[PDB]
UniProtKB/Swiss-Prot annotation:
Organism: Allochromatium vinosum (strain ATCC 17899 / DSM 180 / NBRC 103801 / NCIMB 10441 / D)
Chain's role: Specific class of high-redox-potential 4Fe-4S ferredoxins. Functions in anaerobic electron transport in most purple and in some other photosynthetic bacteria and in at least one genus (Paracoccus) of halophilic, denitrifying bacteria.
Protein name: High-potential iron-sulfur protein
Residues included from the entire protein: 37 to 122 of 122
Domain of life of the organism encoding this protein: Bacteria
Gene Ontology cellular-component annotations: periplasmic space
Amino acid sequence: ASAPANAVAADDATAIALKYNQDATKSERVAAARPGLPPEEQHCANCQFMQADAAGATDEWKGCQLFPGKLINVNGWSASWTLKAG
Ligand code: SF4
């Protein structure tokens, strides 16, 4: 439940550029509708680019390639998601 001290801020420069919503339920994913899988089934957990092996990862909060020294919620989402197809 509780967010980690280093939660990626939704309003971080990176989160802005990426449109990282932190919550997939509220996420613009619905509109952004990335290819691969329907928006409802998209979140960081399924993201090709996610560093699961983040230095400090935990189940709810994994690392994103572009967001070092913070963690993104696995049930969050951003624009450059891409369904894990590799
Ligand atoms: S690139 Fe992937 S892991 Fe990183 S914030 Fe976007 S959806 Fe999440």
